[PDB]
Amino acid sequence: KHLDTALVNAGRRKKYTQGSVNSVIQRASSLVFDTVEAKKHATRNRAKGELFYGRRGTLTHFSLQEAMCELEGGAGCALFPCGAAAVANTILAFVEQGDHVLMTNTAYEPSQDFCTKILAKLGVTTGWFDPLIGADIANLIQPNTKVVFLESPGSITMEVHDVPAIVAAVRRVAPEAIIMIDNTWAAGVLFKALDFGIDISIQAATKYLIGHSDGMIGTAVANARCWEQLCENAYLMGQMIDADTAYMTSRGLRTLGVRLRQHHESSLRVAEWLAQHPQVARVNHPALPGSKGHEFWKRDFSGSSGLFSFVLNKRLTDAELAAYLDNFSLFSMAYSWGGFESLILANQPEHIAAIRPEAEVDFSGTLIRLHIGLENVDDLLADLAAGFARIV
Amino acid sequence: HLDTALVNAGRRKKYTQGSVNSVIQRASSLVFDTVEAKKHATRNRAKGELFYGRRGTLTHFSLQEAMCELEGGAGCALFPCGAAAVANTILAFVEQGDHVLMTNTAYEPSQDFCTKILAKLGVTTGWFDPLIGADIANLIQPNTKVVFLESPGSITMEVHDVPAIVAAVRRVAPEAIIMIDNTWAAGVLFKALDFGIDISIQAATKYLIGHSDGMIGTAVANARCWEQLCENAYLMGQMIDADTAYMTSRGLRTLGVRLRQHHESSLRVAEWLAQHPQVARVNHPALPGSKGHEFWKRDFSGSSGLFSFVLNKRLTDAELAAYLDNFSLFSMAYSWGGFESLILANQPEHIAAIRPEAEVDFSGTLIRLHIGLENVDDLLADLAAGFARIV
Amino acid sequence: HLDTALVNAGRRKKYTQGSVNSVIQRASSLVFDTVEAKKHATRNRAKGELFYGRRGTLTHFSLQEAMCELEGGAGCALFPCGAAAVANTILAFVEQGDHVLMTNTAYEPSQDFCTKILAKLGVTTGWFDPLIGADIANLIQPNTKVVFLESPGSITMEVHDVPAIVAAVRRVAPEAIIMIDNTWAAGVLFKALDFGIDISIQAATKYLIGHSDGMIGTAVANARCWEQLCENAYLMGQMIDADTAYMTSRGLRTLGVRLRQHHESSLRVAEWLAQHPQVARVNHPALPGSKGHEFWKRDFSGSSGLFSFVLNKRLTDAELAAYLDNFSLFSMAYSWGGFESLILANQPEHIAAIRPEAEVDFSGTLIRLHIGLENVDDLLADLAAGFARIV
Amino acid sequence: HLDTALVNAGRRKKYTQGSVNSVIQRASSLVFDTVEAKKHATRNRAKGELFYGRRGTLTHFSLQEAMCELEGGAGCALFPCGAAAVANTILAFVEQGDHVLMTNTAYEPSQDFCTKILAKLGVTTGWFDPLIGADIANLIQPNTKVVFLESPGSITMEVHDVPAIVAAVRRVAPEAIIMIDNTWAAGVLFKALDFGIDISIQAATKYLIGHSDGMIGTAVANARCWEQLCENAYLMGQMIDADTAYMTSRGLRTLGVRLRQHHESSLRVAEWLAQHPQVARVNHPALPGSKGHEFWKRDFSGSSGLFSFVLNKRLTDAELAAYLDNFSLFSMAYSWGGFESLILANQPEHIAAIRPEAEVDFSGTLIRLHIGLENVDDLLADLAAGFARIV
Numbered sequence A: 001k002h003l004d005t006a007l008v009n010a011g012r013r014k015k016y017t018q019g020s021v022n023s024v025i026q027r028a029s030s031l032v033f034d035t036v037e038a039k040k041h042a043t044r045n046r047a048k049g050e051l052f053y054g055r056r057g058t059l060t061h062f063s064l065q066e067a068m069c070e071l072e073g074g075a076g077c078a079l080f081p082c083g084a085a086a087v088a089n090t091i092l093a094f095v096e097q098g099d100h101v102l103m104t105n106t107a108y109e110p111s112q113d114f115c116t117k118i119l120a121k122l123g124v125t126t127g128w129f130d131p132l133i134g135a136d137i138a139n140l141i142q143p144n145t146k147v148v149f150l151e152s153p154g155s156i157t158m159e160v161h162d163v164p165a166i167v168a169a170v171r172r173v174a175p176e177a178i179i180m181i182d183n184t185w186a187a188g189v190l191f192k193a194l195d196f197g198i199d200i201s202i203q204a205a206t207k208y209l210i211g212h213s214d215g216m217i218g219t220a221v222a223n224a225r226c227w228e229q230l231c232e233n234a235y236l237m238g239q240m241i242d243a244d245t246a247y248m249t250s251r252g253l254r255t256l257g258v259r260l261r262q263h264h265e266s267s268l269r270v271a272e273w274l275a276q277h278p279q280v281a282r283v284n285h286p287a288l289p290g291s292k293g294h295e296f297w298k299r300d301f302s303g304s305s306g307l308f309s310f311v312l313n314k315r316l317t318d319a320e321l322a323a324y325l326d327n328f329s330l331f332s333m334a335y336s337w338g339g340f341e342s343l344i345l346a347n348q349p350e351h352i353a354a355i356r357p358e359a360e361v362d363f364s365g366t367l368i369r370l371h372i373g374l375e376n377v378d379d380l381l382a383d384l385a386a387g388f389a390r391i392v
Numbered sequence B, C, D: 001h002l003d004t005a006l007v008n009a010g011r012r013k014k015y016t017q018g019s020v021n022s023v024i025q026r027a028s029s030l031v032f033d034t035v036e037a038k039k040h041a042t043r044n045r046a047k048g049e050l051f052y053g054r055r056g057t058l059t060h061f062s063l064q065e066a067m068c069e070l071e072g073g074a075g076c077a078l079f080p081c082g083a084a085a086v087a088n089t090i091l092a093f094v095e096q097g098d099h100v101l102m103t104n105t106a107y108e109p110s111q112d113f114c115t116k117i118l119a120k121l122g123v124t125t126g127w128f129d130p131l132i133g134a135d136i137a138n139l140i141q142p143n144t145k146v147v148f149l150e151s152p153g154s155i156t157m158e159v160h161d162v163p164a165i166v167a168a169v170r171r172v173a174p175e176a177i178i179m180i181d182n183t184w185a186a187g188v189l190f191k192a193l194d195f196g197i198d199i200s201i202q203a204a205t206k207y208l209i210g211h212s213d214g215m216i217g218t219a220v221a222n223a224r225c226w227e228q229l230c231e232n233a234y235l236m237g238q239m240i241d242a243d244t245a246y247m248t249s250r251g252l253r254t255l256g257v258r259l260r261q262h263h264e265s266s267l268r269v270a271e272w273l274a275q276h277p278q279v280a281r282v283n284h285p286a287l288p289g290s291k292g293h294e295f296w297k298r299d300f301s302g303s304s305g306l307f308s309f310v311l312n313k314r315l316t317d318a319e320l321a322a323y324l325d326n327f328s329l330f331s332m333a334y335s336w337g338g339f340e341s342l343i344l345a346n347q348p349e350h351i352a353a354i355r356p357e358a359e360v361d362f363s364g365t366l367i368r369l370h371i372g373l374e375n376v377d378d379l380l381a382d383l384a385a386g387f388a389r390i391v
């Protein structure tokens, strides 16, 4: 009986708000020390919420960091220019040459590319696992495995991990490993990752936290064991976010509850319609019974967001792809998601297989990924129905 | 002239659309009307076509065009701050087994990135005296990949002989990546890429923003190194928000009038300090006798407002408090490049600890000043009152 | 299809230019490429062509198009806040010797504009009971130029019978300008222009912005009244900054989902208060039995989250402090329409003083609540704890 | 010490909270922790205690303090733009039956406010020649309540003899409200309140913002007039958004270095125009021979960069296009006070139409220039090429 109240109030303390409802926006590089003693005090608390230097943050950042720590149950929150920077720099913060990373083969493609194109040449190897491996992940853990990287639901194809089984297996074989999750789909709040034994919860706050498709920012909330190393190594890479975007992220939290409930209701309705449609082969929605890992979503999540995908009954030709995608009236073609607008994107099976390392896909039709926004669901259904008629 | 270029750089109709300044386009998602439009945007995702917010919007493109014009580069990568620009530009060009050769006067966070991040990834770092000049050739190893310059040096303000260093590097390792932290010159008082440096890095936070209220890093690369810088910085998710990019473009418009005042005022202060009976030496690139001044005179078109001086005595903590706590106009803070004057102190052992494989040549307390836009006679009176407190 | 319209209103390519939201164009000067371009912009300076910052930029045009679509008007004037919109919209249609007829439940600053500004300029003001309905015809004078409505009324929440009032006004004074402060409905829960009202005024500060961090007023006029409103507001220099206009457009996108929560939660709180032994009366338009509820049910498509209730006793200043000072979730502040729940107390004599020529019909302290987006159980517990402190 | 005052004005710890610049506090609702705190805020709602966003936040308070310090006033009211500041400051001091006496060189929208808004409200307007000096006494009527000055005049740049005007007004109507549009001087090059003027009004849009990307009006009043200005502007809902207030404070920090460049460059251009064979007259307050130059020299501490000149001939329509359409650096746009140079043309009869009860004394085409921060030799070359197109 608290999440909605926590979202409205998280990070909103008088020291940050100074009498307004929202935190003040403190734009600053230089932060002034009135005395040498004040400078000494600030230096000793430069990572503990005392004004020291803009790269460590201002009151606006401290307010957002407190909100993220409260909502995701962590000991600290690092901020980044975008989600991709959060993933790359959080992984980097915990590896050194000779280490091994174990990542789900459904990870967001830029996350994979960071591992294969940056980490590889820096002496860090990456292995892969099927998202439904569950307890069998233990057999893949090597003596030098330092990081296990989860993403539930997976990117595009939406497979849900059995996180309890994975975490228990990792803690049995490699108790000191750093378990991370890209928790963007859950907005960090529909899946309480740190309560499951995960060490760090990473978000592209760009998506649901910002909620309006007009700001970019990454967050990483770490437990007490991992916070200091994440904080100091992210700082050595100069990672931070501007004060105004931090303000807009805090601001987005306030409507996250009401927004996510609509995204859940509308997207599940669309998925249930698609699941009965003669032109659809498969619907990948975590909240839909029968979807991959749905039993884990039902057990471990408190709700759903609005992003999912479905497979058409056929592989669209280039001409059919253009006829389908070019003539939507409400859905817009774009990258990213999590805003008020509904989006659509297409992928051929071989496009997905190319970003499923050491694995193949199990479908042959064209995959359509939908983000269901805040439009009237009957209008969205009519848009999709017209699209079906263009490719029949 | 530079003042005209600063006023107009990056201001094209496609960005400004009737206003004086570029529009502010806040976006993650960028919409493709057709599959063909998406294909075109993908092909030009790094060439100023709208593709995805992490690659930029019209606002970023305008700033990038301004920076390329002003610094004479093929591309400009953007970062959340100067420290991110340095760390990720170096990282973009190294791999396990490589070697980085860096001036021992590099900004401390730049050194810390090398010794704490690169070292654990199998990338080693070596050091050189800022005045080493042509003799840097003897320090280039078979695996040296990056040569990192910073002229003037951090805090102590030594000016490199860049033509001598570059010629020496190109004689031994013509393919090496030469980088410079060009923040003190705001990228315009020293045309790094015209000297054969490959990448000019800036904490745009300082003079480009110019008001101490935004943080952003830039890296302008020549044609040979741009694609690797662009794509590897992108793989690390590096970008800046649209509003800060707008404020950086906006800062350019007054950069000329601001720098001229910083130069005039700071040189007056340095000249007075150079004759002062409590001052051992003044480190100001524009002051005759300062280390590398002849190279500043030859290679720079002007000066900014940041410099340092060494006191005759080592202040005690009690004297440091009496001195610094009671200034009326100078403020204690990190960073610089704004309209306000700032002051910071370092003891010699503090500087020695960030001069790897080298010794300091002074024993008194080192004071770093940023000279802002206040009336210079008011600033001189503030400094004179300070001297009276540490007699 | 209100949710769809809210998501798309004002979003045309010329404004969004590839992003989901409009670009932010900050500008005073707007540049003309040729003499012919200057002529064209001058003729269309009030018709959505870039002429001068005071007339607006692309960002303002986007919001104005959205507001005209959502409220079904011919034009939308923008103002620095709701009070500026009310004051200047009334002023735009009066001259010396005119008469204004205003509901006695009007927002107090709206009353004060009439009694302190209009009065000294030769414009008189008369008052009517919010439930007068068709009997307003007897109050219309030959010089009555404006009839000003506010439904539900400020604080006490009485709902007008707008159809009866409009029909009566048109019978007697067909040319009179009928205005309404439609802030409680966010302009969308009550379609004022469809009822024959001429101008719908909003403190967009409230639900359109929706986060308590921006101030802006809007006034949407029908075709008959738009040109006069537009030009007379412009002569008073009324405008809003581009960034606030952007944030207002942005607020529209979540307005439907927000209002539905405000409706559900506030009605649940009202139903609990209506059975509470320490409550004398609940003033919620959506609650059966409230003053004008039958008119809300018939004429509105929903409810927002602002309402009030009367305590069984008039709290003393000591009891008022014990009550208000110790709420954990409700905050004491002016304004409303945000994500946070707010509480504000008015003693009955305070209300009577801002009910011109009328008395109040209650004797307990009046508590006005804005129900935000918090968990209702927590809000009820906060209210329950308050009751325990004054029982 | 103006540069030092500009850097530090309004920058107190209560507003800056550790940063160099004031915090940006966006707010409508301002929370009261207790009933006692609310009573204190209510009592001091116009005295810098947080009460309600329409009265201001910390950001507004900081700007107001800076403006009061820089212009030597008791209070500073904020408006959405300069036109709103003029219209509402006049309206704040008149009532039906009053008379306004305004210079016939007043900014045209200021005149249109008087003839189109004030007139229908029973307030009349008279006019005087800007060089009338002591002879203004003969135009003061028993009901003259406001005397409105603008020095230099709009477009034609005539400088008032303010001491002679004020002395005459105080002899005849000591209680009259003397106002001045002090935008050209940016409120700092002419200390209006020190001359006995009651209210100094500014389009802060111009030089205070300094970058053509924000609109805001200010009015600084002496102690005698502050309360009436403050409360009556508030009844009209006049305010500015927090972010623009921040950007205005920020513009102050470079105002000194900018104005000195605008002065130096614009006077160089004026001196060149004054000796040019294609120029009939140059209207620049700092140029000897210009109308009222002796008053500028005596009463101002410097110049900005806006002025005008008259061509030797009346350009035809074709010549106007050839002249204005082909400039490379000067842009055609309204407003001024930014970093870019601007050019606009007016035929004599256009000016005569906005010179009430007066004619113009020139027959050539009038060119108004704003001289920005570009290199002045580049600007001179642009103007020279323009002369060659019409010779």
Ligand SMILES: *Cc1c(COP(=O)(O)O)cnc(C)c1O
Pocket (backbone or CB within 6 Å): A082, A083, A084, A085, A087, A108, A155, A182, A184, A185, A203, A204, A205, A206, A207, A216, A217, A218, A336, B028, B054, B237
């Ligand atoms: C979008 C996405 C990212 C990248 O976020 P950006 O802010 O766009 O860099 C990371 N993880 C997931 C799951 C994403 O969908």
Ligand SMILES: *Cc1c(COP(=O)(O)O)cnc(C)c1O
Pocket (backbone or CB within 6 Å): A029, A055, A238, B081, B082, B083, B084, B086, B107, B154, B181, B183, B184, B202, B203, B204, B205, B206, B215, B216, B217, B335
């Ligand atoms: C300040 C500084 C940096 C770091 O810039 P930030 O924007 O504060 O991260 C980099 N290089 C130099 C020379 C600096 O002085």
Ligand SMILES: *Cc1c(COP(=O)(O)O)cnc(C)c1O
Pocket (backbone or CB within 6 Å): C081, C082, C083, C084, C086, C107, C154, C181, C183, C184, C202, C203, C204, C205, C206, C215, C216, C217, C335, D028, D054, D237
């Ligand atoms: C708040 C309020 C206003 C004034 O709005 P502001 O934006 O604060 O000026 C006007 N009308 C009503 C009904 C209000 O509640």
Ligand SMILES: *Cc1c(COP(=O)(O)O)cnc(C)c1O
Pocket (backbone or CB within 6 Å): C028, C054, C237, D080, D081, D082, D083, D084, D107, D154, D181, D183, D184, D202, D203, D204, D205, D206, D215, D216, D217, D335
């Ligand atoms: C531009 C101008 C104004 C009006 O200022 P805005 O902010 O554009 O409304 C007022 N006075 C003078 C002298 C001006 O030039």
Ligand SMILES: [Mg+2]
Pocket (backbone or CB within 6 Å): A353, A354, A355, A356, A357, A358, A359, A360
């Ligand atoms: Mg594969």
Ligand SMILES: [Mg+2]
Pocket (backbone or CB within 6 Å): B351, B352, B353, B354, B355, B356, B357, B358, B359, B360
């Ligand atoms: Mg050493």
Ligand SMILES: [Mg+2]
Pocket (backbone or CB within 6 Å): C351, C352, C353, C354, C355, C356, C357, C358, C359
């Ligand atoms: Mg009464």
Ligand SMILES: [Mg+2]
Pocket (backbone or CB within 6 Å): D352, D353, D354, D355, D356, D357, D358, D359
């Ligand atoms: Mg005339």
